[PDB]
Write an enzyme that holds these catalytic residues in place. Structure first.
Site, mmCIF file in Angstrom:
data_model
loop_
_atom_site.group_PDB
_atom_site.id
_atom_site.type_symbol
_atom_site.label_atom_id
_atom_site.label_comp_id
_atom_site.label_asym_id
_atom_site.label_seq_id
_atom_site.Cartn_x
_atom_site.Cartn_y
_atom_site.Cartn_z
ATOM 1 N N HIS E 28 0.722 -0.891 -0.268
ATOM 2 C CA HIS E 28 -0.309 -0.489 -0.064
ATOM 3 C C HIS E 28 1.016 1.289 -0.041
ATOM 4 O O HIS E 28 0.366 2.316 -0.713
ATOM 5 C CB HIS E 28 -0.899 -0.146 1.232
ATOM 6 N N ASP E 50 1.314 -8.783 2.333
ATOM 7 C CA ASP E 50 1.425 -6.885 1.388
ATOM 8 C C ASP E 50 2.325 -6.774 1.597
ATOM 9 O O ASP E 50 2.855 -5.320 2.195
ATOM 10 C CB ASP E 50 0.348 -6.651 3.005
ATOM 11 N N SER E 102 4.689 2.835 8.211
ATOM 12 C CA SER E 102 4.300 1.479 7.533
ATOM 13 C C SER E 102 5.935 1.005 7.342
ATOM 14 O O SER E 102 6.448 2.354 6.081
ATOM 15 C CB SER E 102 3.325 1.176 7.001
#
Lengths: 151, 51, 151, 151, 151
Positions: E28, E50, E102
């Site tokens: 992402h 992810d 992140s």
């Protein structure tokens, strides 16, 4: 406390009191008692006395006002100060009482409830009060002066 | 004739309701700006056209 | 108090204000007004201004905010601090105002309300407020800068 | 606050504990939870454990008591004083427990929940408590002495 | 440096780190790594976790962080300070970290990476983190608290 104001729209328009294990509120005062424990009991009508009554919750029966039928002539007190009891009439100085003071009990020199004020009449020197009291035989009677106005 | 009269009455009712609804909504929309402003000129002509 | 919080599930979801005998609260804010006197008022909807309005009790009318339409350029006061008024737009520093602050009033240096904050625009360094105010003729108008979002 | 009292008629008749991120309240304790948000969540019934449970609000997920299944012989504490654990039984001094103490967890020397108290028996020397605890396998197990009175 | 910011339009969207000889970044996170030696690497899309990964260039092999699967309960360090890990959950105080963080690694007392942060959940006074960790057998797994928002 023992007296619980009655509120309609967030404003006090009267007072409820607990006497001898019963909750007494004026009948002409519309609204909810400012409480949660005493407000959940269903009240019976006593239209002959302009009063309503109900049973005090078991946890509250001990925290109640005492009353007496012996009312010797002299001076009595209530929320607004001294009250004169003479000639079989409860009276306060002119302007001491007024609208909103409905259901407020009158106390003697011993802290006992002697009457519940429902209204009054403004005389030449003092304002006479319309009250619910007990006669010499202890029977509930409505003692009102001529032309009394509900408060 | 029965169908015609019923259709005419239905049309009249729907049209009158729509007309009154539009006129009342017009009054509400026209006057609301002044209700929230008590200290306003509120011209007399406003009370004649929007009321 | 001039500002009254509105609670939905116990959290504040906005504020209701009383101006010139009338109460206003954001139309898009759900919940009860945290005031027994104001919570009992049935308000009318004004979708043009995204607000509801109605009259207040006689006890509050004496202390309502004063309406004014004189909005010269300069700095104005509001709950979270000062507000800048330029180009006929109300703006504040970034981080001043957000979700739940809708309905707050903006006042001049004379204590008169000039606009009701319903939302705003989150810019890089400043924010523009979406407010309801009055024009030079004193007629209610809603100012919603492009990209304004209700708070 | 991690342990909230439960009220039925305005008085406390038990406690609801937030342990492990979940609400633990006895089933025999009727009434609302002191915290409005804990009372607003739907709870599930576990009749085999005499307790009711449900997921806590988002903000209460972290602010919760941790629990442990290890309860070696020794002393533990609760709001009534110290708790002694012997012969796999939770015993408190004579007269320490009583009506209204149900739902209070027993904490170890680290502040972790060891067991939830539900009742007890006066043995004439010490009082044994009916508790909900976890066995050596970490499975919820109810332990109540014969004749225990729900508190 | 072993951590490299990822920027799409000049703003930091996330971070990349070199662990065990591989470059890691979340799916992402949009933008390019500031280090051209890493940005030019074709990354495999591990949608299971992810994460994008690739082989560290020989010129960058020295800038590699050691990792381990031995993660006992306790406190761990990262770019924003200490991180508390308990009950198979990674937690940080509320307000410590957010969008853009992140891909940061979490290091133990020996400087070994134990997890990579993908997002988190605010749980009252503490925020739970979504992290990619290795189980007791060293197998890569993804831990995601319910409702976790990618950072």
């Amino acid at each position: 406390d023992k007296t619980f104001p009655i509120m309609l729209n967030g404003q006090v328009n009267g007072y409820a009191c607990v006497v001898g294990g019963r909750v007494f509120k004026p009948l002409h005062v519309e609204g909810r008692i400012d409480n949660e424990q005493l407000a959940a009991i269903k009240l019976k009508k006593a239209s002959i006395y302009d009063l309503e009554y109900g049973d005090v919750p078991q946890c509250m029966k001990s925290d109640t006002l005492q009353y007496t039928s012996d009312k010797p002539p002299g001076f009595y007190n209530w929320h607004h100060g001294a009250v004169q009891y003479e000639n079989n009439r409860f009276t306060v100085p002119r302007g001491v009482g007024g609208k909103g003071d409905s259901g407020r009990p009158i106390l003697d020199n011993k802290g006992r409830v002697v009457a519940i004020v429902l209204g009054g009449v403004n005389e030449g020197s003092r304002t006479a009060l319309s009250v619910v009291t007990w006669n010499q035989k202890g029977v509930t009677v409505k003692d009102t002066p001529e032309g009394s106005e509900p408060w | 004739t029965i169908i015609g009269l019923c259709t005419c009455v239905a049309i009249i009712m729907v049209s009158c309701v729509t007309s009154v609804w539009l006129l009342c909504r017009t009054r509400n929309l026209c006057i609301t700006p002044y209700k929230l402003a008590p200290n306003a000129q509120v011209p007399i002509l406003l009370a004649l056209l929007c009321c």
